Write an enzyme that holds these catalytic residues in place. Structure first.
Site, short mmCIF file in Angstrom:
data_model
loop_
_atom_site.label_atom_id
_atom_site.label_comp_id
_atom_site.label_asym_id
_atom_site.label_seq_id
_atom_site.Cartn_x
_atom_site.Cartn_y
_atom_site.Cartn_z
N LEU A 54 39.62 56.08 64.77
CA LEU A 54 40.40 55.46 63.79
C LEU A 54 41.14 56.51 63.01
O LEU A 54 40.75 57.68 63.02
CB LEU A 54 39.49 54.74 62.84
CG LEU A 54 39.48 53.22 62.96
CD1 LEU A 54 40.36 52.72 64.07
CD2 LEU A 54 38.04 52.83 63.24
N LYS A 64 29.10 61.89 59.47
CA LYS A 64 28.40 61.08 58.50
C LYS A 64 27.95 59.76 59.06
O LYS A 64 26.79 59.40 58.97
CB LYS A 64 29.06 61.05 57.12
CG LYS A 64 28.44 62.07 56.18
CD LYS A 64 29.42 62.81 55.27
CE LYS A 64 29.99 64.07 55.93
NZ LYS A 64 30.85 64.89 55.03
N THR A 93 29.24 56.90 31.41
CA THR A 93 30.44 56.26 31.72
C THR A 93 30.53 54.78 31.38
O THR A 93 31.63 54.29 31.09
CB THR A 93 30.68 56.50 33.17
OG1 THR A 93 31.35 57.76 33.35
CG2 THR A 93 31.40 55.28 33.74
N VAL A 95 29.83 53.43 28.96
CA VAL A 95 30.30 53.37 27.60
C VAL A 95 31.79 53.32 27.44
O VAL A 95 32.48 54.26 27.84
CB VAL A 95 29.76 54.47 26.77
CG1 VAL A 95 30.03 54.03 25.35
CG2 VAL A 95 28.27 54.59 27.09
N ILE A 98 34.37 56.09 27.28
CA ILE A 98 33.94 57.22 28.01
C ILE A 98 34.38 57.22 29.41
O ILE A 98 33.80 56.53 30.21
CB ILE A 98 32.45 57.49 27.98
CG1 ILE A 98 31.98 57.70 26.54
CG2 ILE A 98 32.22 58.76 28.81
CD1 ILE A 98 30.57 58.28 26.48
N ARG A 141 27.84 39.29 29.88
CA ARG A 141 28.95 38.37 30.27
C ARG A 141 29.29 37.33 29.21
O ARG A 141 28.46 37.02 28.33
CB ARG A 141 28.64 37.60 31.54
CG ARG A 141 28.49 38.44 32.79
CD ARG A 141 29.82 38.96 33.35
NE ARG A 141 30.73 37.89 33.76
CZ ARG A 141 31.80 38.07 34.54
NH1 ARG A 141 32.15 39.27 35.03
NH2 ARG A 141 32.55 37.00 34.85
N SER A 172 39.94 34.47 34.56
CA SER A 172 39.18 33.55 35.38
C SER A 172 38.77 32.40 34.54
O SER A 172 38.37 31.42 35.13
CB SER A 172 37.96 34.22 35.96
OG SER A 172 37.46 35.15 35.01
N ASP A 182 35.64 39.39 29.34
CA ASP A 182 36.39 39.67 28.16
C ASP A 182 37.41 38.62 27.95
O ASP A 182 37.62 37.77 28.82
CB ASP A 182 37.12 40.98 28.33
CG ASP A 182 37.62 41.23 29.72
OD1 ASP A 182 38.31 40.45 30.38
OD2 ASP A 182 37.21 42.39 30.16
N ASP A 248 41.68 41.36 24.12
CA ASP A 248 42.99 41.91 24.13
C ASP A 248 44.00 40.88 23.90
O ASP A 248 43.89 39.76 24.43
CB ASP A 248 43.28 42.65 25.45
CG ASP A 248 42.22 43.71 25.78
OD1 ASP A 248 41.23 43.96 25.09
OD2 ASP A 248 42.48 44.39 26.85
NA NA Z 1 33.45 54.05 30.02
#
Ligand code: NA
Ligand code: NA
Length: 327
Positions: A54, A64, A93, A95, A98, A141, A172, A182, A248
């Site tokens: 491929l 691998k 992360t 966070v 971050i 959630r 959604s 969110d 937002d």
């Molecule tokens: Na983050």
DNA sequence: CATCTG
DNA sequence: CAGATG
């Protein structure tokens, strides 16, 4: 879709790490197209050599796949899953505020945990700080039951401020989903458009209101067209207060609402398919507009739209209720 | 892509 | 302003 799973997954594991831990964007990017290709590949990869065939398929990857196919594991994958450093980055992360970049710095500073973080609350910026304050809340959630409640408020206040505003909860939430992550509100005002030179107030005005009433709690970022924040459903009768939710608010010229609206609603799949047919039917779609396709290769010019109807109409298609906008 | 930081 | 985050 299930034939080349492990393979495709491992690769994603491999690709993920390269970018987030090491800085290998090339490598990263390698694992990516690779899994993308094996992803479409119609057969059961039975060997590296087979794969190698491929494109994007190099010798290393092959190598691998071999070990993986060969043994149910990968040494490298195994080493990484241990490596506390790698781990840390993955975590830090989570966070909000971050990213990875940031993640590395802190780690090399020895900030590795959540507690590490508080102790050094000095070293974080505002976002970074809110992020920390609401780590859990953040990860939790959002249930449509509350979703509807939020929608309720936002829409009412937006109303009071000006009768001419048009708010919309995309996402959604909009496609029916029982829980969301969110809240995305798309906003426009008649008085705002493509040419119309600005009117930031248009956005600031409502921001203020939502905070006025205490819906909005903090600011993540606030510009002339995009507001990034934190909100909350008024704890009723003290015993059960709500979680903190990400939210937002974004301004859009009235002249490119529905496309946006359409677009923000999804799903990605619906879009694509809708986007493709668009192309068939002699058109173009993107985030802000639909355009008649010229034959010379391509061409443009703003198709006028007054609803999600007008769009579809153009591409001569069945108006899709948002629920069935799934794929 | 739009905002922030530094 | 280059660069990071969403
Ligand atoms: Na983050
Ligand atoms: Na550079």
């Amino acid at each position: 879709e299930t034939l080349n799973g492990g393979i495709t997954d491992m690769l994603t594991e491999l690709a993920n790490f390269e970018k987030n831990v090491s800085q290998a964007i090339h490598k990263y990017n390698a694992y990516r197209k690779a899994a993308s290709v094996i992803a479409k590949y119609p057969h059961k990869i039975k060997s590296g050599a087979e794969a190698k065939k491929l494109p994007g398929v190099g010798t290393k990857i092959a190598e691998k796949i071999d070990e993986f196919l060969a043994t149910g594991k990968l040494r490298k994958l195994e080493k990484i899953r241990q490596d506390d450093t790698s781990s840390s980055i993955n975590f830090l992360t989570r966070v909000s505020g971050i990213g990875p970049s940031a993640a590395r710095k802190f780690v090399d500073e020895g900030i590795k945990t959540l507690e590490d973080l508080r102790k050094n609350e000095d070293k974080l910026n505002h976002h970074q700080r809110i992020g920390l304050k609401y780590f859990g809340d953040f990860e939790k959630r959002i249930p449509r039951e509350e979703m509807l409640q939020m929608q309720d408020i936002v829409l009412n206040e937006v109303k009071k401020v000006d009768s001419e505003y048009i708010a919309t909860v995309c996402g959604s939430f909009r496609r029916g989903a029982e829980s969301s992550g969110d809240m995305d509100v798309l906003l426009t005002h008649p008085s705002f458009t493509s040419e119309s030179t600005k009117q930031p107030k248009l956005l600031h005005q409502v921001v203020e209101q939502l905070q006025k009433v205490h819906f909005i709690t903090d600011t993540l970022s606030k510009g002339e067209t995009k507001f990034m924040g934190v909100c909350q459903l008024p704890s009723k009768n003290d015993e059960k207060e709500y979680p903190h939710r990400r939210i937002d608010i974004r301004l859009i010229p009235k002249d490119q609402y529905y496309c946006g609206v359409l677009y923000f609603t999804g799903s990605d799949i619906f879009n694509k398919n809708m986007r493709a047919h668009a192309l068939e039917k002699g058109f173009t779609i993107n985030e802000y507009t639909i355009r008649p396709l010229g034959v010379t290769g391509v061409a443009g010019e703003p198709l006028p739209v007054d609803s999600e109807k007008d769009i579809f109409d153009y591409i001569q298609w069945k108006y899709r209720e948002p629920k069935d906008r799934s794929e």
